[PDB]
Design a binder for this molecule. Structure first.
Ligand SMILES: Nc1nc2c(ncn2[C@@H]2O[C@H](COP(=O)(O)O)[C@@H](O)[C@H]2O)c(=O)[nH]1
Ligand SMILES: Nc1nc2c(ncn2[C@@H]2O[C@H](COP(=O)(O)O)[C@@H](O)[C@H]2O)c(=O)[nH]1
Ligand SMILES: Nc1nc2c(ncn2[C@@H]2O[C@H](COP(=O)(O)O)[C@@H](O)[C@H]2O)c(=O)[nH]1
Ligand SMILES: CCCCCCCCCCCCCC(=O)O
Ligand SMILES: CCCCCCCCCCCCCC(=O)O
Ligand SMILES: *C(=O)CCCCCCCCCCCCC
Ligand SMILES: *C(=O)CCCCCCCCCCCCC
Ligand SMILES: *C(=O)CCCCCCCCCCCCC
Ligand SMILES: [Ca+2]
Ligand SMILES: [Ca+2]
Ligand SMILES: [Ca+2]
Lengths: 283, 267, 239, 68, 283, 239, 239, 60, 68, 68
C-alpha cells in the first residue's frame, strides 16, 4: 500500500515587512515566475490531497484515437478489382486530434495498440444479397512486396503479420513494440534525407526535406477475402492508435493553426488563431 | 613443432594412403566426424555388418580433365562407388547401408597456372530434370552415373518432346542445376583448390539423413560438385588442360538386412 | 470447458479501456534506450512554464506579435492598463497560452495562477503600477479605488525587472469548469497606475510590459476531453 | 505470478489516504510473452518542473534579488 | 530472472605494428573470413545489448502462412454434386512463401498449427436465400477410404480427426504432432521410391524420383454439411500452416528462381535471378 | 458460470499469435529423435557464412558464373577495380548473396560487414590492391586519393591468398532499413591498385579475384517481413 | 466480468478433442462394477494373438476355409511352396488377419512379425522345409538358392508340430506406412523344400500346413485412421 | 514425473548350438507363437523408446 | 484442487525420457460434480497379452519342448 | 502448475538488463495433455556459427598464418 504524491498544500502564513521580496524577480534569466499565494498574501493552512494523476503522459495519451478511414469495395463490375483492396500508409498525420497531442513533444518513445473498426454498407440500389464478409489486414514493412491485385500471392503472409476479421465480431486489435530504428521516435526533423553535393541542382533538397522524407513504417494492405458477389458492397475500415508505455522529451508549443500536409506548412487561408477583443480593458 | 606444416598432410585408411605437400588444412563437415549407430539410436535389429578395412579405404575414380571450356562436374555418394571393390559388394548385398567418407580432390599444375576449383559436398543433392513437359522426370540410370558422374553446362535446353533427353539432370552450373545461385554453394562443407595456393582438397563428411541408416541403392546422401570459380589458365596455349582426380574413402560403414545381391537396371 | 458466462460490455470497444492485446511482432528486439535531455512526465509540468499573454489582442493588433505588447506611457490616467477575466481556457486571450492550451484538453481545473509582468521600458523610466485579482461576486473593478479593495500588489519598477501577482485559488467549488460558465466564475485581474511612469530628458515616453501566465504547484487539471482549438476538414475517402 | 496493487480511490472510498482495506486491490497477471502487450504502465506522479521553469545555472532563491 | 545473450560488443583498440596479421587468411581452407573491426581499425568501446532474438528459428517460422486455397460449391444443379466437396493433398508446395523458408534447410522437425479461414460468396445472379453453412474438414491419412460423394459413409469419422466449423465463428484451428515416420522431416530427397532391377525399362525411375515420390501425409476432405439449396453458393477455404517447436539441419542456399512443380525443376522462361548493372564500377 | 467479458481482438486470427490449440492427434507417440549433423539455431549463423558476390554482373556476364569473377590484369590503371554501394538487401549485386537473401526476410539490420577477397591469379603474379569503405555523406570515391582518405586496407598479394576488409558499423541510426532508403545510407566500398599486378615471363597477364561477403558477430537483423525475391502466379482454383 | 478474449478454434468441434462436458444425468448411481474375465487394455495385445493367414486365396479357394490350407506333398520340387509380400495391412491375404485388421485402423507400424506354421500331415510323414524373410531391395527370391541368402530357418517336421520364423524389424524408416507404398517396402517371405516331405507305405501323400501371423512385443502402431475394410450404403433419411 | 512403458527393446545376441530350440513349438496347445528376433537370428542391442500409447482402448 | 501432470512428449521435446523441465506439465481442474463429465482417463499402458497368447495351464518356456 | 517467466523487454522498459521488476513476468499454464498443443518454445539464443564458418580440422587463430 502506498500514497500518490499530492499537489503542494498551502501552509498558513501572515504579514511581513522584510527585505525578502518573493514578489519581485527578473524573468530575463529565462526562469519562470515562482511566487505562490504564501509569498504574496496571508494564507490559511490547507491540506491538499488532489493529484496530477491524470496529466501523466500515460493517462494523457491513454486513448484509442482514430487515425484514418480506409475505404474499399468488393464489386463484380468491370473496373472494381482495384477497388477490391486498398493500401494505407502508416502514420498519424491523416487526422489532427492525436497528431496535435503527440506534436506537443519533439521526441517520444512507446508501444502501440492498434484497434480496427469495420463498417460495411450498400452503395447504389444493388441492395441485394451478399454472404458475410471476412477481411484481412496485412502489415507490409518497408521492402516487402506489395499486392498487385486483391489476390496476388502476397496475401500469403508467411512473414508479414496479418489479422483476419469476421465482420460482426469484436473490433480486432493488437499490440506493436517500439519499432523505431532510432533510440526514440522523432516527431520533427530539421534535416534532409541525404546530402546534396557540389555539382547538383541549385534547388536540390526541396524534394527530400522534413521528417516525412526520412520516416517510414510501411503500409497496411486491407481487403475482403470473399470473392465478388452479384451486388456490390462497400466497406469502411477505421484505424485506431493508442500509444502506451510512453515517454516524451523536449516540449514545444501546440499546433495553433490548421494543418497543411504532413509538414509544419501553413495555409494563408487560415492563420489567425486568436480573436479580436473589443478593448484591452474589456473583461 | 619440428615444422609441422599446415600444408603437408598424410591420410590413411585400410591399406590406402594419400599424401599432399600443398593442401590447405582439411575440413570436417558440420564439425562432426563419422560415427556408428549407437544402441540408443539404432533401428534395424539384426546384427550389423561392419566391413572395416575391407571397405573403408581409398577408392580412386577415373580422373576428369579441366579445360578452359570445362563447366563443372558432379558425383553422388554412395553411387559413385557402387562398383568400388569390396565396399560395393557389401552395399549391394544389404538392404540398409550407412556411411561417411573422406573426400580427397587432387589437381596439381605449376606456379605459372591460374585457376580455382570450388569443391562442395552437398547433402541431398537433387537437380532439376531436362524437360519442361514433366516434373521430377529423371531415370534411375541417368541419376546414377557412377565412377563417371555427370558434368555441368551453362545452358538450359529442355526436350519436352524427346522423352529420352528429359529423363536426365539439367546440370545448369550458375544454378547448381537446383535453382539456387552457385554463389552461395558455400553454405555447404567445402574447400577451394586455388592453383596458386593448393593442389588438394580434403573434406571429411559424416553420414547425414533424417534416419540413422537408409537404403543406399535408392538414395544418395551426398553429392560432390566441383565448379571452376576461376577459369583454368596458362600463359602458353589458349587451350590448357590439367587432370582432376577424385579419391573417396568410406568410413564407419555398417549394413543391415542381408539377402541376395541387388543388381539394378543397366544398359 | 470452464463454465463461463458473458456479461454486459462483452465485445465492446471502449477507447479508454486498458487491456492486454497480443503482439503482432513477437520477440522484437527493441532499440536500446538512451538518455535524452529534457524528458517530461506530466502535462502539468508544462503548465508551470511561464508563457506570454496576448493581453492586447485588439483590432489591428490581434494575430500579430504586437498583441503580446502591453501599452504603457508617460501620461497619468486613472484608467485600467488592462482588464482580464479569470477563465484560463475560456477567455479569447488566455485560451491560447501554454497554460490555456493544456487546460483545454481537460474539463476541470484547480489551483493558483501566477501572473508575472516584465516592464520593458528604458532603464531611466520609473513608476509604480498596481496589479489586482478580485474574486467574483461584485461590480467588476473599473477604477483603482475598487481594485485596491481586493487581492493586489503595488509593483515598483526598478532593477528587478519582473514582478508576479498571484491569483490565490479562491473558489466555492473545489474544481472549476474549463468551458465558460457562470457558476464557475473566475474573477477580475486588472491593472492601474499607483503613481505614473516617469521619464526624464530624452527618454522614450511610451513603452510596454510583457504579461506571462503560469500555474502554481497546487494546480491540477482533470477529465481528459478533446480540444476545440483545432479543426479538420472531413477527410476525402476514395469511395 | 499475479501481482496485486492499489486501485485508484473512487467515489465512496478510503479517505484519500488510499490506505483503507484490501477492497482497493486489483490483480494483474500478464498473459503475453511480449511486454508491449501489457496494460498501461503504472501511474507515475514524479516530476521535475524545474528543467523547464528554472534551468538557470546559478541558483536563485525566491526571497533573494533575482539579479544580484 | 535471466539475461538474453547479446551480440558481440566492441572493445576499444588502437594501433598495431606486429607480425600478427588478422587481415590476411586463406579461404581455400573452406573457412569463412573472420576479421572484425578491432582487427582492422582503431575502435572505441561499445556495449552491445541487441540480440538475434528474432532470427531464432522458432521466431523465423513463427507465423501462420497460407499454404493453399480450396474451393467447393454447394449447388442444387445437375453436375454440382462433385462440387459439393473437395479433396486437398497435404503439403506446403501449393504456395511459395513458406515453402521457400523451410527450403532453407535440408531437414526439419516440428509440431504443426493448422488454422482455417472460410469465405463464402454468390456465383451468378442466383443471389437468393441460403441458411447458414456448417463445414467439415476431415483428415484422411494414407490408407483410409476416401469420400465418393459429398455424403457417403466416410464422413462418419469414427477414427479420422474432423473439424466442424459454423461459418461466422472464429477461424477453426488445431495442433498436430511431428508425425514424420522418419527421425526428421526430409525437405529434399536425392533418391527413388524403390530400386529398379536388372530386367526393366531403360528409363525406369523417371516416374518415382524426388522427395515427392516418397512423401505422403494424406489429404483434407472438405465439404459443407448442409444440403443443396435453391440458389447455388460458393465457398473458399484457406489452409494456414505454422511450424512450431521446430529445429532444422543442414543449411542450403535459398530458392533463387521461380518454382516449377513440387520438385527443384526450373523453367527456361524464368531463370535470370539477378539484374544487369551498368558497370562493375557503378555504385 | 464464471462472469467473463470479451475484449477487443476477441475471435480474431492474427498470423503472429502464439496460442495453445487442441491436438487433433491425441497421444501420438512421436518418433524418437536422434542426433543429426549440422543443426541450426539462428538465421544469423548462416549470415556469418562467407558467400560469393556477383561483383561483375555486367551485361554478358550477369546470370552466369562469370559474374562472380572480378577482372584483374597486368596493366597499371588508376581506375576503380570495382565499386559497390553498402546496402546488403538493396543493391542488385548484394541482395542475392546468402547474407542478402537473409536480410531480405527482415526489415532492419545492424552490424559490421566482412568483405573477403581471394586472389586467384598465378602463384607467380605479385601486386598490392587497396580495398576501402567510405561511410556516406560526401562525394563518392571515384579515384584512389579519395578512397584512401577513408577506412581502407592495403592488401598485399602473397602466400596468404585471401584478405578481408571490414565495414565497421558506422551509422547514425542504430538500425538500417533493409529496403533502399536515403536516410539509411550505407557508404561506398571500392578497390584500386596500390601498385599494379606484376607477372613475369610466360605468366597469364590477366586473371580474377573472388569477392565474398559475410556478417560479423555484432550483426543482428529484426522485424520479420516477406521477401520480394520470389514470385508466384495467382493459384488456379477449380471454381 | 473477468476480461477474456476468444482465440482461434473458439466454438469449433474437433472430433478428437478431450474436454469436460456437463452431465445430462446428475447424481446417477452407476452400476457396481464387478470383475469380468479377459479384460483388454490395448489393441496391440490382440495384435500378438496368433491368427490364420489365407496363404492360398487362389481362385476356387478364396473366401472358403480351403484358403487357409497350404498345399504340401510327396513329390520333390524346387518351387516356392508360397510367396508373401511383407505388407501387414496392404497384401490382400494379410490385410484380413487379426493383426492386419488392427493395423488397418492405424497409419504407421513398427516391429517384428512372427510367422508360425503348423504342419498337419500324418504323424508318419517326415520332411524339412525352409522359411525365409528377405528384406527389400533386390530381385525377389524365386528359387531356394536365393531365399537361403537372406534371413531363414530350416524347419524340421517332427514331434514339435509348429515352427516360427521371425521377420526381424529391418527397415530404413522407423515406422512403415500401413497403406501400400514403395518407399515403405516390406520384403519377401517365401518357403521351399530343404529335402522333400517323405511318407511311407499307406500314407496320405498330400497334406497341408497352417500359417499364422502375430506381432512381437517390440511391435507398435500409431495414427488412428478409419478402416477401408467396411462399407455402408449412404443412409436413407426421411426428407 | 514418470516414464511411460516402452515396447520390448532388442538385446544383442549371437550364435547358438544348444538343445534349446525357441524356434519350435506346438500351437495345438492353444498358445500363440512366442519367438522373437533374438531366438532366431543374431541381433544387435537396441534401446526402444516407442510406446503402444495410441492403442490404449481409451485412445482407440 | 488442480492436479498437474506430465504431457505427451512432442516434437522438439525432452529426450523420450519425459523427465526434462516443468515445461511438460499440464494442469487439470475438474469442474463438474459427476465423474462422467471428465476428460479421457489417464493413459494406461499396462497390458497382459498372455491371457490371450498363452492361457495354457502348465506353463511352458520358450527354450523347452512345447510338448514334453 | 503455472510457470512464470521473463517477458521480452518492451518500449519504456527495464534498461535492456531485463532485471527490473516483476512487472516483466508472464504466466503460463499448459492446458492440453499433448505437448504439441503448447505455445512457441522458449526463445533460445544459443548458437555455434563455427560448424559453418570454420569446420576446419586443425584450428587456426586469427593472428596466425592461415596457411603455415
Ligand atoms: N511584522 C512584525 N514584525 C515585528 C513584530 N514585532 C517585532 N517585529 C520586528 O519585525 C521583524 C520581522 O518580523 P515579521 O514577522 O516580519 C522582527 O525580527 C522584529 O524586529 C510584529 O508583531 N510584527
Ligand atoms: N605501436 C607501438 N609500439 C611500441 C611503442 N613503444 C614501444 N613499442 C614497441 O612495439 C611493440 C608492440 O607494441 P604495439 O602496441 O604494437 C612493443 O613490444 C615495443 O617493442 C608505442 O608507443 N607504440
Ligand atoms: N557356440 C560356441 N560354443 C562354444 C564355444 N566354445 C565352447 N563352446 C561350447 O558350446 C557350449 C554352448 O555355448 P554357445 O554359446 O552355444 C559351451 O558350453 C561349450 O561347451 C564357442 O566359441 N562358441
Ligand atoms: C497488423 C498491423 C501492423 C501495424 C504496424 C504498425 C507499425 C507501427 C509504426 C509506428 C507508428 C506510430 C509512430 C509515430 O509515427 O510516431
Ligand atoms: C484435421 C486436420 C488434420 C491435418 C493433418 C496434417 C498432417 C501434417 C503433415 C505434416 C505437413 C507438413 C510437413 C512438411 O511437409 O514438411
Ligand atoms: C502466478 O501466475 C500464479 C497464479 C496463477 C493463477 C492462474 C491465473 C490464470 C491463468 C493465467 C494465464 C495462463 C496462460 C497460459
Ligand atoms: C484447487 O482447485 C485450487 C485452485 C483453484 C484455482 C481456480 C480455478 C478456477 C475455478 C475452477 C472452477 C470453479 C467452479 C465453481
Ligand atoms: C498450477 O496449475 C496451480 C495453479 C492453478 C490456477 C488455476 C488455473 C486455471 C485452470 C487451468 C486449466 C485447467 C483445465 C481443467
Ligand atoms: Ca500536499
Ligand atoms: Ca555483448
Ligand atoms: Ca524397452
Amino acid at each position: 500500500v502506498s500514497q500518490p504524491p499530492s499537489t503542494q498544500s498551502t501552509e498558513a502564513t501572515s504579514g511581513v515587512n522584510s527585505q525578502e521580496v518573493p514578489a519581485l524577480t527578473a524573468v530575463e534569466t529565462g526562469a519562470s515566475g515562482q511566487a505562490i499565494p504564501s509569498d504574496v498574501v496571508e494564507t490559511r493552512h490547507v491540506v491538499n490531497y488532489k493529484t496530477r494523476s491524470e496529466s501523466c503522459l500515460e493517462s494523457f495519451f491513454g486513448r484509442a484515437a482514430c487515425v484514418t478511414i480506409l475505404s474499399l469495395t468488393n464489386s463484380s463490375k468491370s473496373g472494381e478489382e482495384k477497388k477490391h483492396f486498398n493500401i494505407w500508409n502508416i502514420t498519424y498525420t491523416d487526422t489532427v486530434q492525436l497528431r496535435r497531442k503527440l506534436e506537443f513533444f519533439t521526441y517520444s518513445r512507446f508501444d502501440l495498440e492498434m484497434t480496427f473498426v469495420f463498417t460495411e454498407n450498400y452503395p447504389s440500389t444493388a441492395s441485394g444479397e451478399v454472404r458475410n464478409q471476412v477481411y484481412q489486414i496485412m502489415y507490409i514493412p518497408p521492402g516487402a512486396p506489395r499486392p498487385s491485385s486483391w489476390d496476388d500471392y502476397t496475401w500469403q503472409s508467411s512473414s508479414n503479420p496479418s489479422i483476419f476479421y469476421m465482420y460482426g465480431n469484436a473490433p480486432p486489435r493488437m499490440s506493436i513494440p517500439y519499432v523505431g530504428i532510432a533510440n526514440a521516435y522523432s516527431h520533427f526533423y530539421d534535416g534532409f534525407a541525404r546530402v546534396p553535393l557540389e555539382g547538383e541542382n541549385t534547388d536540390a533538397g526541396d524534394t527530400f526535406y522534413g521528417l516525412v522524407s526520412i520516416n517510414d513504417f510501411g503500409v497496411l494492405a486491407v481487403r475482403a477475402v470473399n470473392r465478388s458477389n452479384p451486388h456490390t458492397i462497400h466497406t469502411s475500415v477505421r484505424v485506431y492508435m493508442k500509444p502506451k508505455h510512453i515517454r516524451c522529451w523536449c516540449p514545444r508549443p501546440p499546433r495553433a493553426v490548421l494543418y497543411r500536409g504532413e509538414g509544419v506548412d501553413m495555409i494563408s487561408s487560415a492563420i489567425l488563431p486568436l480573436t479580436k477583443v473589443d478593448s484591452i480593458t474589456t473583461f | 613443432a619440428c615444422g609441422y606444416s599446415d600444408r603437408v598432410r598424410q591420410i590413411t585408411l585400410g591399406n590406402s594412403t594419400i599424401t599432399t605437400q600443398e593442401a590447405a588444412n582439411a575440413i570436417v563437415a558440420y564439425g562432426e566426424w563419422p560415427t556408428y549407430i549407437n544402441d540408443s539410436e539404432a533401428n534395424p535389429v539384426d546384427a550389423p555388418t561392419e566391413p572395416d578395412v575391407s571397405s573403408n579405404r581409398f577408392y580412386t575414380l577415373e580422373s576428369v580433365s579441366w579445360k578452359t571450356t570445362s563447366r563443372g562436374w558432379w558425383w553422388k555418394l554412395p553411387d559413385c562407388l557402387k562398383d568400388m571393390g569390396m565396399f560395393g559388394q557389401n552395399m549391394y548385398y544389404h538392404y540398409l547401408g550407412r556411411s561417411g567418407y573422406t573426400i580427397h580432390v587432387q589437381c596439381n599444375a605449376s606456379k605459372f597456372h591460374q585457376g580455382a576449383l570450388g569443391v562442395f559436398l552437398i547433402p541431398e543433392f537433387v537437380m532439376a530434370c531436362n524437360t519442361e513437359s514433366k516434373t521430377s522426370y529423371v531415370s534411375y540410370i541417368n541419376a546414377n552415373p557412377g565412377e563417371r558422374g555427370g558434368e555441368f553446362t551453362n545452358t538450359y535446353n529442355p526436350s519436352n518432346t524427346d522423352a529420352s533427353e528429359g529423363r536426365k539432370f539439367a546440370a545448369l552450373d550458375y544454378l547448381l542445376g537446383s535453382g539456387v545461385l552457385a554463389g552461395n554453394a558455400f553454405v555447404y562443407p567445402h574447400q577451394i583448390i586455388n592453383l596458386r595456393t593448393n593442389n588438394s582438397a580434403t573434406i571429411v563428411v559424416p553420414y547425414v539423413n533424417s534416419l540413422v541408416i537408409d537404403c543406399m541403392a535408392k538414395h544418395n546422401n551426398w553429392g560432390i560438385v566441383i565448379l571452376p570459380l576461376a577459369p583454368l589458365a596458362f600463359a602458353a596455349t589458349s587451350s590448357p588442360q590439367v587432370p582432376i582426380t577424385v579419391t573417396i574413402a568410406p568410413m564407419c560403414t555398417e549394413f543391415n538386412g542381408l539377402r541376395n545381391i541387388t543388381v539394378p537396371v543397366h544398359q | 470447458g470452464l463454465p463461463t458466462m458473458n456479461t454486459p460490455g462483452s465485445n465492446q470497444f471502449l477507447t479508454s479501456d486498458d487491456f492486454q492485446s497480443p503482439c503482432a511482432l513477437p520477440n522484437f528486439d527493441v532499440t536500446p534506450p538512451i538518455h535524452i535531455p529534457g524528458e517530461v512526465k506530466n502535462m502539468m509540468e508544462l503548465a508551470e512554464i511561464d508563457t506570454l499573454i496576448p493581453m492586447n489582442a485588439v483590432d489591428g493588433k490581434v494575430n500579430t506579435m504586437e498583441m503580446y505588447q502591453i501599452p504603457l506611457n508617460d501620461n497619468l490616467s486613472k484608467a485600467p492598463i488592462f482588464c482580464l477575466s479569470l477563465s484560463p481556457a475560456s477567455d479569447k486571450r488566455l485560451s491560447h497560452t501554454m497554460l490555456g492550451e493544456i487546460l483545454n484538453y481537460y474539463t476541470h481545473w484547480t489551483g493558483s495562477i501566477r501572473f508575472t509582468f516584465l516592464f520593458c521600458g528604458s532603464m531611466m523610466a520609473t513608476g509604480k503600477l498596481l496589479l489586482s485579482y478580485s474574486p467574483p461576486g461584485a461590480k467588476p473593478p473599473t477604477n483603482r479605488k475598487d481594485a485596491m479593495l481586493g487581492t493586489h500588489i503595488i509593483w515598483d519598477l526598478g532593477l528587478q525587472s519582473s514582478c508576479s501577482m498571484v491569483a490565490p485559488w479562491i473558489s466555492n467549488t473545489v474544481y472549476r469548469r474549463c468551458a465558460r460558465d457562470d457558476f464557475t466564475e473566475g474573477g477580475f485581474i486588472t491593472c492601474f497606475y499607483q503613481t505614473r511612469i516617469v521619464v526624464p530628458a530624452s527618454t522614450p515616453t511610451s513603452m510596454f510590459m510583457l504579461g506571462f501566465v503560469s500555474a502554481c504547484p497546487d494546480f491540477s487539471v482533470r477529465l481528459l476531453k478533446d480540444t476545440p482549438h483545432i479543426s479538420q476538414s472531413k477527410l476525402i475517402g476514395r469511395t | 505470478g499475479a501481482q496485486v496493487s492499489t486501485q485508484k480511490t473512487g467515489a465512496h472510498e478510503n479517505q484519500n489516504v488510499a490506505a483503507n482495506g484490501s477492497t482497493i486491490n486489483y490483480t494483474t497477471i500478464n498473459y503475453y510473452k511480449d511486454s508491449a502487450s501489457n496494460s498501461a504502465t503504472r501511474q507515475d506522479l514524479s516530476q521535475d518542473p524545474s528543467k523547464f521553469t528554472e534551468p538557470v545555472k546559478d541558483l536563485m532563491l525566491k526571497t533573494a534579488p533575482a539579479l544580484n
